[PDB]
């Protein structure tokens, strides 16, 4: 419950269903994942070491992902859409990857 | 495949134990903790779970400290004086120990 490992390991692993599902959103630049809302959401509801919000609540204050004031998510434009969405970090993605590899 | 709460939990925990010595210094905002690189040094000898570069390298690496290029602490100013310092950032130290009590 109160191992850093289990949201450091749920990153990686949201990538990693993401991929396998092909529902995989990068920014223009690759600097930014981009992940719908309520998909994040259904995807973190299923290991109950913490809520949606508390996993969501570390990622922020870990700087993991990228946020709007008082929010978990951002205002972004992909593909047309400009609305808001769960902006993970590929620079921190790619460091949880490589930890999570070792 | 580190555990990350070992790194983690030796964050909080030299940052407790210096809040009580009254020997750590905080930014004018607030944003970070000043503290002496050798004080630190010493302490991340004593849980040999890694080596001290080892431990600094992944504090720098998840971004838990601020550091100048190819080192591990950070020139700074303290009351007109200018020295080097191991930059904590207090956003990292504050989820870190919120994480281990609730």
Known sequence: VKDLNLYA?????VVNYL????????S???????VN????????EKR????????????????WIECAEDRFNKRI??????????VIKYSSYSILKRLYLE
Chains 1, 2 share one sequence.
């Open 9 to 13: 390991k749920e990153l990686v692993d």
């Open 48 to 63: 109950n070491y913490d809520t949606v919000d508390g996993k969501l609540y570390l990622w922020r204050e870990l700087e």
């Open 37 to 44: 809302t309520e998909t994040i959401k259904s995807m973190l």
């Open 77 to 86: 434009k992909i593909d047309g859409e400009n609305m808001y969405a769960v």
């Open 19 to 26: 991929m396998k599902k092909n529902q995989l959103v990068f």
């Open 28 to 34: 223009r630049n690759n600097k930014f994942i981009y």
